[PDB]
């Protein structure tokens, strides 16, 4: 997270960290959506251009970690589900994956799931200018390593401007966010923040909803550039299918 | 309430009915703002143009009543406090009064206080077009008597339009609400709804706040006319003074 600030204790209890099991390596961010399911970006698990193709036994997730310098839960994975139409070949379309924990995790003051949006919440809040919040353990830029979870609030950007900022073919399964040059504020996700949640607080019921997943961007906090996020609601049917049918 | 609908059970647990003790006569609406304080319009208690000047022993309040056709609490009053600058002579400016219950009332699924606005809530929600909700036992028009509490949602109206709708000198201690001719929806408070609450639900904390008190209007649900409400936040300092200093 670039140009963000230290998160308050328990501010993001759905925050999950994805690690290579051994040797230890922080790979990406992720989020808790139930006692046994974690949501992340598919490219955090499968990305051939990088010779990356992790299987369940290669990873571990940490839940409840506020800083570096117990109360922290380390869980193994039982199964990984990558969206069948995730496109790592071209533009990271449908960059989403679900990971089922071997055992359900116990909730606490520091561990609690985030909600997934319904049609009404997505229609109401996915609007240009409306701010979401991104959290992560990514570096503090592109050279800068945090010992406390970082947080930054960023506004959703109109689609024509998102399209404009890149040569990549963007799709309706992505949205972009960040401040414009001259809006006078900065901030962006970066590297290891990948896979982490973009959340918004509903004015209807006061609950936090995960509207996006840190997916890609070009550079970190560069003027005229915006971070792209996986549009969670657009892929809700697949998410629901996996969680509803499996999870035994 | 004209052009409204039946309230759901427990939808307005802060609703209070002001009655002449004996013989029984429904006089006005009111609201519960704590276990021992009820808020209403001063004209419900003191209004010389009508030879009205009630004292504590002349009244009773009912709390928790959803319909006509126990669970209902009937309370006596210990003291009445009318704003010292309430102007019954000209335009009902500062039409507000507080009534202290002889004994504190027990809260239940049907009895619960409403919040009073702070500066931030008033600044955010008192905007033209933003809708509030009015509830009451007033007739169904100006000829029509409800056996179930009625409710209607109405939008706040821009001040120049409020000014325009009447010959009376309005003040900043009042705001008006209701639909415009051609907005295609109707609704208004009427008669006995007087003194009742105009509430709004905060998108910040999900709590209901009482922004106004049904004060006056000309006619009921007439095209081109709007109901005027006492601006509760504008008179917060006096309200707070009374509640903070007294209430023994």
């Amino acid at each position: 997270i670039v140009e963000g600030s230290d998160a308050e204790i328990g501010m993001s209890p759905w925050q999950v960290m994805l690690f290579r099991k051994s040797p230890q390596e922080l790979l990406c961010g992720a989020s808790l959506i139930s006692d046994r399911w974690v949501l992340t970006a598919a490219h955090c698990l499968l990305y051939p251009p990088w010779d990356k193709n992790f299987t369940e036994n290669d990873l571990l997730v940490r839940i409840g970690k506020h800083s570096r310098t117990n109360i922290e839960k380390i869980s193994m994975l039982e199964k990984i589900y990558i969206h069948p139409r995730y496109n790592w070949r071209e533009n990271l379309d449908r960059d989403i994956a679900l990971m089922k924990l071997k055992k359900p995790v116990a909730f606490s003051d520091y561990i609690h799931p985030v909600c997934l949006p319904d049609r009404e919440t997505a229609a109401s809040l996915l609007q240009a200018g409306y701010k979401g919040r991104v959290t992560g353990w990514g570096p503090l830029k592109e050279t800068g390593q945090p010992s406390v979870l970082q947080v930054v609030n960023l506004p959703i950007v109109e689609r024509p401007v998102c399209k404009d900022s890149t040569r990549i073919r963007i799709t309706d399964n992505m949205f972009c966010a960040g401040y414009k040059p001259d809006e006078g504020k900065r901030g962006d996700a970066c590297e290891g923040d990948s896979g982490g949640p973009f959340v918004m607080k509903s004015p209807f019921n006061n609950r936090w909803y995960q509207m996006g997943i840190v997916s890609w961007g070009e550079g970190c906090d560069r003027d005229g550039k915006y971070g792209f996020y996986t549009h969670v609601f657009r892929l809700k049917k697949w998410i629901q299918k996996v969680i509803d049918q499996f999870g035994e | 309430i004209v052009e409204g609908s039946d309230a759901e059970i427990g939808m307005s647990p802060w609703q209070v009915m002001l009655f002449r003790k004996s013989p029984q006569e429904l006089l006005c609406g009111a609201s519960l703002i704590s276990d021992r304080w009820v808020l209403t319009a001063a004209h419900c208690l003191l209004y010389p143009p009508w030879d009205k000047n009630f004292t504590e022993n002349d009244l009773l309040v009912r709390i928790g009543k959803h319909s006509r056709t126990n669970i209902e609490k009937i309370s006596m009053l210990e003291k009445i406090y009318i704003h010292p600058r309430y102007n019954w002579r000209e335009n009902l400016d500062r039409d507000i009064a507080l009534m202290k219950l002889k004994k504190p009332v027990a809260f239940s699924d049907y009895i619960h206080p409403v919040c009073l606005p702070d500066r931030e809530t008033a600044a955010s929600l008192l905007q033209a077009g933003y809708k509030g909700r009015v509830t009451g036992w007033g007739p169904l028009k100006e000829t029509g008597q409800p056996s179930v509490l009625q409710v209607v949602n109405l939008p706040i109206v821009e001040r120049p339009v409020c000014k325009d709708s009447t010959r009376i000198r309005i003040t900043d201690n009042m705001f008006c609400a209701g639909y415009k001719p051609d907005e295609g929806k109707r609704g208004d408070a009427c008669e006995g709804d007087s003194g009742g609450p105009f509430v709004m639900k905060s998108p910040f904390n999900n709590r209901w706040y009482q922004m106004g008190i049904v004060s006056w209007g000309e006619g009921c649900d007439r095209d081109g006319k709007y109901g005027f409400y006492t601006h509760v936040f504008r008179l917060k300092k006096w309200i707070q003074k009374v509640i903070d200093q007294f209430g023994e």
Binding site: I9, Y110, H112, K131, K201 | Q127, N205
Partner: peptide
């Protein structure tokens, strides 16, 4: 699930975090 999105140390204790108001204001501001 049913208690999703309500934080034990914030919403559940009626406490606001330092910047959540910034988000909500962006939704209601005209």
């Amino acid at each position: 699930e049913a208690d999703c999105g309500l934080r034990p140390l914030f919403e559940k204790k009626s406490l606001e975090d330092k910047t959540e108001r910034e988000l909500l204001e962006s939704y209601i501001d005209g």
